[PDB]
């Protein structure tokens, strides 16, 4: 990057503010993935919006290619500079504005986490539901299409993602609903907002996003179910999915994942297929949902069911990632995130856990299985290519037996660089070269986030 650029970008954000040192552009060349660090040729912290807008415009009429940066915590290499250029650090512009208690609705800067809106709402029986384990940037959950435990009951973020603002690759400023407009619904021309949500950085730099907010429950009563095999968890999952039982959260542990969640949290469950559970509702609604739930369970050879202790269950479930990956310190891993109809999920789960225990490979289970959804978490060690490639093959073969099911290769994490082909055979010829379209009339020159997704 030459001097005179780097010497136009601190004219816009400061001199602090851009850094082409090499631990610094280390630190932002990768995520939790797998993939290779690779170091962008600058990071760059932009202080307002205005400032995003003169750093793109430089950066794009330069050829210089553009990486939104967040909190790093994705799982598919967005952040890698695969082309190099200039990572865009945006956690600066970290101001909560236009809390709408009354309309249940609230704006965010990238540099707000769930963690830190939840706190904000402290006290006024308002809560921000999407919860992946990480405490993410919300707009970085905006741009990867989140999703967390939560969502079964409450959405995703394309369910409660009311209004964007985004800079454009070459600076211009959209407001896709419309500036400070926020309603329950529209049918006013094309839905722009639903393209940029699950866009990863290529189409647009988010920098607010207006989100749903949801009355706290009532009250709240969770509880874990053990089961002689994963055939029997899953079976229940979708008889409580068919019975309509408003469960807010239903997470499926395997056997293998509560041993190392008991091991990172000393949570001391079972050591078998579990589900973790979570109702919301009134006492009168809660009565009710327990006895139909239990009964469920037991029909498929559930054991019986088992405020602080509800901290901690989920606490440890949104740091499974950190505990499988504790099982063999010093390895990294890989997260597959198929998603498929419900009336499939057995046949793919028992199949998944059957293939990591007839393979050398070392991995665990976890997921939404509420929501099509679950995650193989394998290990890796970092210096074996040979083990690596067989990871990579399992999460492939993986990826394509859920497309055959008729699901997605994935429900919540995105494509970044390592389902891209999965993505190509998902929505075949016309639906590529229609996303195609959609990337280029927005950055003709290919330079936002380069190489990810498309
Ligand atoms: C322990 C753990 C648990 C997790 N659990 C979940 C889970 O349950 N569900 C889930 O969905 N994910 C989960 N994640 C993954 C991750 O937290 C989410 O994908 C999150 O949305 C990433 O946000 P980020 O700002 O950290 O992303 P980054 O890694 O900073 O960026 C991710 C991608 O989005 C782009 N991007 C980031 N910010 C912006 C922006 N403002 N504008 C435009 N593009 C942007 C980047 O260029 C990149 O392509 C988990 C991760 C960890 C480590
Ligand atoms: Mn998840």
């Known amino acids: ?267 001391n469950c079972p050591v078998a297929p579990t589900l973790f559970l979570e109702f919301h509702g009134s006492q009168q609604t809660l009565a009710e949902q327990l006895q139909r739930t239990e009964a469920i369970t037991q029909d498929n050879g559930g054991s019986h069911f088992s405020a602080e202790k509800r901290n901690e269950l989920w606490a440890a479930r949104h740091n499974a990632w950190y505990a499988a990956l504790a099982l063999s310190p010093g390895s990294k891993a890989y997260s597959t995130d198929v998603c498929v109809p419900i009336s499939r999920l057995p046949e793919i789960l028992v199949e998944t856990k059957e293939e990591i225990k007839a393979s050398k490979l070392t991995g665990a289970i976890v997921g939404h299985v509420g929501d099509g959804n679950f995650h193989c978490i394998l290990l890796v060690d970092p210096d074996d290519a040979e083990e690596q490639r067989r990871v990579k093959a399992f999460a492939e073969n993986l990826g394509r037996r859920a497309l055959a099911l008729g699901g997605t290769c994935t429900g919540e994490h995105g494509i970044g660089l390592g389902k891209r082909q999965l993505l190509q055979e998902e929505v075949g010829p016309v639906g590529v070269e229609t996303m195609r379209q959609l990337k280029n009339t927005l950055d003709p020159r290919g330079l936002m986030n380069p190489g990810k997704v498309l």
């Not at 919006?49 to 915590?73: E, H, K």
């Open 1 to 267: 990057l030459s001097q005179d650029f780097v010497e136009a970008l601190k004219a816009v954000v400061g001199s602090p503010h851009v850094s082409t040192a090499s631990a610094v552009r280390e630190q932002h060349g990768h995520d939790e993935s797998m993939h290779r660090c690779q170091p962008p040729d600058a990071v760059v912290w932009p202080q307002n919006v205005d400032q995003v807008s003169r750093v793109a415009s430089l950066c794009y009429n330069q050829g210089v290619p553009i990486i939104p940066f967040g909190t790093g915590t994705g799982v598919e290499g967005g952040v890698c500079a695969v082309q190099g250029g200039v990572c865009i650090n945006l956690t600066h512009m970290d101001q909560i504005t236009e809390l709408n208690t009354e309309d249940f609705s609230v704006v965010v800067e990238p540099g707000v986490t769930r963690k830190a809106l939840n706190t904000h709402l402290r006290d006024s029986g308002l809560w921000f539901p999407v919860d992946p384990g990480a405490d993410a940037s919300l707009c970085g959950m905006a741009a990867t299409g989140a999703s967390g435990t939560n969502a079964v009951r409450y959405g995703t973020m394309r369910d409660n993602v009311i209004n964007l603002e985004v800079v454009l690759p070459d600076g211009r400023l959209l407001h896709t609903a419309g500036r400070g407009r926020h309603y329950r619904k529209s049918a006013a021309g094309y839905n722009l907002t639903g393209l940029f949500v699950g866009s990863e950085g290529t189409l647009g730099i988010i920098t607010s996003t207006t989100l749903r907010l949801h009355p706290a429950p009532e009250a709240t009563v969770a509880a874990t179910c053990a089961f002689p095999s994963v055939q029997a968890a899953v079976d229940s999952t979708v008889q409580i999915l068919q019975a309509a039982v408003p469960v807010a959260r239903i997470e499926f542990l395997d056997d293998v994942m509560m041993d190392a969640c008991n091991r990172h949290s000393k949570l």
